[PDB]
Design a binder for this molecule. Structure first.
Ligand SMILES: Nc1nc2c(ncn2[C@@H]2O[C@H](COP(=O)(O)OP(=O)(O)OP(=O)(O)O)[C@@H](O)[C@H]2O)c(=O)[nH]1
Ligand SMILES: [Mg+2]
Length: 171
């Protein structure tokens, strides 16, 4: 099929850069301001290994350890991008919680999860190492990657990887 349609949900603690990361991939530029997100939805094309896709990304509202995981993100989503900020020990802690909640609701289903460490560029304020994010991602059997909403290439690879992990379970 010339074109496949896959829906992606982007979850994580507030201000980690879910929007920026998404904007970078879709529009191509790095938005420098900060407007908390209620929920934006972009539909962009992207080819992964010759297969073109009609990617529908759901850039969700930041969540914290207490917030309840929304049910519409619980069904009919082909892949999840769980992102956190390497400049925040808090985003990392919260992501572990959101991951568990996600798995609960999704029931016993083979849904592809991918962990992303954002703000790779903010060297001076990095508080989490690469190896720590990796370990976690390995505890989940999820593809791990670090990225920078300013480094467009790293933003494209995040969404490219989720597709890659998607097709894997399908097959
Ligand atoms: N230096 C740097 N700043 C970033 C990066 N990614 C995001 N930011 C900044 O982090 C702040 C918040 O980014 P957002 O994309 O709004 O984060 P968010 O998770 O969408 O925010 P919520 O919708 O509330 O969850 C903004 O100032 C972004 O410009 C990055 O890779 N490097
Ligand atoms: Mg936002």
């Amino acid at each position: 099929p010339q074109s496949k349609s896959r829906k992606i949900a982007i979850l994580g603690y507030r201000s980690v850069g879910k929007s920026s990361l998404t904007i970078q991939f879709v529009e191509g530029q790095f938005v420098d301001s900060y407007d908390p997100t209620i929920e934006n939805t972009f539909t962009k094309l992207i080819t992964v290994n010759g297969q073109e896709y009609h990617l529908q990304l759901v850039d969700t509202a930041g969540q914290d350890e207490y917030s309840i995981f929304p049910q519409t993100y619980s069904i009919d989503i082909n892949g999840y991008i769980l992102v956190y900020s390497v400049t925040s020990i808090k985003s990392f802690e919260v992501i572990k919680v959101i991951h568990g909640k996600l798995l609960d609701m999704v029931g016993k289903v083979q849904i592809p999860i991918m962990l992303v460490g954002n703000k790779k560029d903010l060297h001076m304020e990095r508080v989490i190492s690469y190896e720590e994010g990796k370990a976690l991602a390995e505890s989940w059997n999820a593809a791990f990657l670090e990225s920078s909403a300013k480094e467009n290439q790293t933003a494209v690879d995040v969404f490219r990887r989720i597709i890659l992990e998607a097709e894997k379970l399908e097959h």
